Structure 1
């Protein structure tokens, strides 16, 4: 049994070498840029634009902690002044940090549990580690947090439902915002019964501090690795966050495009072995999943090792069936082993990725959320197959870019862990989406050698027989009709790939 099958990975397209020449970075109606584009220079910390803080406190922008409209009933007082007073105290014990955060979150005094924070500090860290945390890391995090109005001078628009919009901000700007999120300073993002931001993911880090899960220390180690690095030396690059909503979806049954190339392998991971490729994040509709709470699978691990991803939660509304989020430029700061209960922070990572002409690391991640299936047969219903095709296709498609300038898609068992999908069906769905979007596929089966062989055999069978995307989708519709629709038992009598082979061969 070979470690990989299909097209050699060397034959696949990769960034930035496959990339078209970037246009000049400029703000426009569909592109927010929070730095001085005229002053952007390699190895220099970007200058925020505008020079001085400008506030927008409304339903289309982020509500900044430093806003003069961020008030707290005392008579109205200034929450930002309160944050400053609370955080500029010295911490020598974890209760100090609890008490600090709670001074400007009084309504949550009884609801927010800090057991994981207290245990990390007192019961996991060695004396010298804790001392480095409270004497150096935390005070530095406080200072970049409180620099917010000097760093994030431009209002940040919400990437709201149905918007086709990008935000390009500096890694420094992201570091300052994430320090705020750590100290739980973002207003209107806390109430269980909130309305305005009920359609947005959590941003404040309070649920990282609750409970006694053995994985919280590992999450905190991964994040403090990030925070120690970005507060000790300011990062110099940019990161772009793009919401993409597609209106026109293919008529899959009539699609005449042929399948594209496949490399499939049971070794390697998306994040290590997909350099220069469109990397898939197996997302929740609320991007980043439980990264700021208990979650610790594929999405949350990526969000932790590349923490600049987390800030997407500040401004990215829940994804609808036709939408995705594309993040370009995030930097890897940590290495890890395992997942969930076996997840461990391994060590600090020195990202060696090149930067593009906008000083973004050459790393493009798309968050596409699969459906969470409670019953196995649910996923074969045509509207659910069509839904998955269209989600993957929106994630893969780059309107107005030629195929020769599209990197391969680096993906894997999307939706087939926590979300209960079938890997063989999802693989074919992704192969069809990629084909329609004119991209090759690099599939990581994550240890499953038999799945690698099965995907390869099917793809080569379909390719050799010259079946189009439409031809293959029609075969999915036949499997649903003959084996799933009138099936009363929990599983179908015949499996999908055997069915396809028999259906094609016998005609």
Structure 2
């Protein structure tokens, strides 16, 4: 009949907050921006900002804030215009359109609001729609205009090559995302913009356009979030860390043993990987590409844990050797389905514990797989190393002892319609985690046959005591003997059968 899970029992895997290191005092440093008063940080209490009063930096190293004195429009304060536009009664979707357009006159022809209109009138029921413009919208306006009182410290841009963290409160994020809803962020809109060309869009204008059925679902999911945040203010902190490694394992010679594996075709990363390092199948432009298009794994996580979206404000396109690590985000929505079948189910009430820094024990890492538009490309040794390096970067924690690292909760990273081979990518992640000295928890999402195969291969390589280097050498043998001279889209003999054969015919 076939089992539901294989390998190590999931309750034997290291998980937060149990496995956690003893956190030192939270404090600002060269590599850590802290936007809250640490001495006044108390459990279940809304964090006070630091500094007390708004300081502005309008430069190329910080986020260009909408409440800045240097944000200008036809010449006067664009922020005071934002205030006059938003301090109005909404009763019809066009009011909100005309409000957002008052400080975006150049995009009146480019920004379509049809999806907003049709959500307002067709999707929402009368009472649901009334509640939106009577309460939710005015409450989002109020927290959006309180931005200079809420976010007082200039937020550094996490540029490529930077190894830097930013710890802010959820309440601060709420105000930033509310601003992103109303499309207040300057310099972020133009097609021929220069400074932020290598950053994803932050303004939510694209969620209002078109005649697609995906749009109302994304709006349901976000309005759920905004409803919660405006009715009951969140009290925790969230950390955003960009990691960028220059040096990587010498994969051919790496002597590190494979680690433990739990593999299952039932469960989810977000549901069953609680307290573990949860992988986000990212786009290099985090949160779903420059544009935010799609309802795929990354898009979904960003919608159900909306606080992740704010990373699009200050996170530059990820390079090959980089990742973004986010600790502390809350789950607000529950969902069903995927892509065209994605549906908002109901609100979620997050019951996870917190660490000493008041961050929820939820660690997500954004690692972008490559898009293999030609199938064979991934077996090319350099492309394997690339995937190895990207995964390793997401899993490695410099200076943290292995017994303090949670298991990695992951799945079919970059696979399916993205072109990656599940069996290869499973092996790549396994090797990467071994080099990082973390155990693996792998979700195959319904594919029971894949669960088996990954399990059999892991067991094979563990019992035969093949280290990372020995396994990686098998991947090179596969390319040379089966891939480089292949005239067909895929080779006659698959990876795993070749690996078994290669090892069984040795010594």
TM-score calculated relative to the size of structure 1? 0.99
Whether 1:364 aligns to 2:352 is no
Change (3 A) 1:176 1:291: farther
Matches within 5 A, 1:291-440: 293-440=292-439
For the 8 Å contact 1:259–1:432, the answer to whether it is kept is yes
Change (3 A) 1:293 1:319: closer
Which residue in 1 is equivalent to 2:52? 51
Aligned equivalents of 1:333, 1:387: Cα separation in 2? 34
1:229 is paired with a residue of what secondary structure?
A: helix
For the 8 Å contact 1:175–1:230, the answer to whether it is kept is yes
For the 8 Å contact 1:57–1:63, the answer to whether it is kept is yes
For the 8 Å contact 2:200–2:291, the answer to whether it is kept is no
Aligned equivalents of 2:143, 2:227: Cα separation in 1? 11
For the 8 Å contact 1:416–1:423, the answer to whether it is kept is yes
Change (3 A) 1:418 1:176: farther
1:10 is paired with a residue of what secondary structure?
A: helix
Which residue in 2 is equivalent to 1:212? 211
**How many equivalent residue pairs?**
505
Gaps of 5+ in 1: none
Aligned equivalents of 2:488, 2:289: Cα separation in 1? 34
Deviation at 1:291, TM superposition (A): 9.4
For the 8 Å contact 1:31–1:168, the answer to whether it is kept is yes
Deviation at 1:77, TM superposition (A): 1.4
For the 8 Å contact 2:201–2:290, the answer to whether it is kept is no
Deviation at 1:265, TM superposition (A): 0.2
Deviation at 1:39, TM superposition (A): 0.4
For the 8 Å contact 1:166–1:240, the answer to whether it is kept is yes
Deviating above 6 A after TM superposition, structure 1's stretches of 4 or more consecutive aligned residues are none
Deviations for 1:382-435, whole angstroms, at most 9, x for unmatched residues?
110000000000000000001100000000000003421000000000000000
Deviations for 1:87-128, whole angstroms, at most 9, x for unmatched residues?
001000000000000000011000001110000001111111
For the 8 Å contact 2:240–2:324, the answer to whether it is kept is yes
For the 8 Å contact 1:435–1:469, the answer to whether it is kept is yes
Deviation at 1:278, TM superposition (A): 0.2
For the 8 Å contact 1:291–1:304, the answer to whether it is kept is no
Deviation at 1:292, TM superposition (A): 6.4
Aligned equivalents of 2:76, 2:308: Cα separation in 1? 33
Deviation at 1:156, TM superposition (A): 0.1
2:239 is paired with a residue of what secondary structure?
A: strand
TM-score calculated relative to the size of structure 2? 0.99
Which residue in 2 is equivalent to 1:140? 139
Deviations for 1:244-263, whole angstroms, at most 9, x for unmatched residues?
00111010000011100000
Aligned equivalents of 1:8, 1:126: Cα separation in 2? 45
Deviation at 1:489, TM superposition (A): 1.3
For the 8 Å contact 1:291–1:300, the answer to whether it is kept is no
2:481 is paired with a residue of what secondary structure?
A: helix
1:311 is paired with a residue of what secondary structure?
A: helix
Aligned equivalents of 2:369, 2:478: Cα separation in 1? 20
Deviation at 1:72, TM superposition (A): 1.2
For the 8 Å contact 2:64–2:185, the answer to whether it is kept is yes
Gaps of 5+ in 2: none
For the 8 Å contact 2:9–2:262, the answer to whether it is kept is yes
Deviations for 1:39-87, whole angstroms, at most 9, x for unmatched residues?
00001110000000000000000000000000013xx211100100000
2:416 is paired with a residue of what secondary structure?
A: coil
For the 8 Å contact 2:159–2:315, the answer to whether it is kept is yes
Aligned equivalents of 1:417, 1:209: Cα separation in 2? 29
